[PDB]
């Protein structure tokens, strides 16, 4: 909702910054073993905990 507390807004701020693709240069690192962000979250598909 528009009305929210500071703690909830700070929680949503971290989830927003966390939900982004991995950098392209990661693939070139030695022994990467990382293909894509496995923790990507979509608002409609998977709902947040709170």
């Amino acid at each position: 909702s528009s009305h929210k507390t500071f703690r909830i807004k700070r929680f949503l701020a971290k989830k927003q910054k966390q939900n982004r693709p991995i950098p392209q240069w990661i693939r070139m690192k030695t022994g990467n073993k990382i293909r894509y962000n496995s923790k990507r979250r979509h608002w409609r598909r998977t709902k947040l905990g709170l």
């Binding site: 807004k9 700070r10 949503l12 701020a13 927003q16 910054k17």
Partner: peptide
């Protein structure tokens, strides 16, 4: 004037 952005 002060606001807090959606990214914190």
């Amino acid at each position: 004037n002060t606001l807090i952005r959606p990214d914190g």
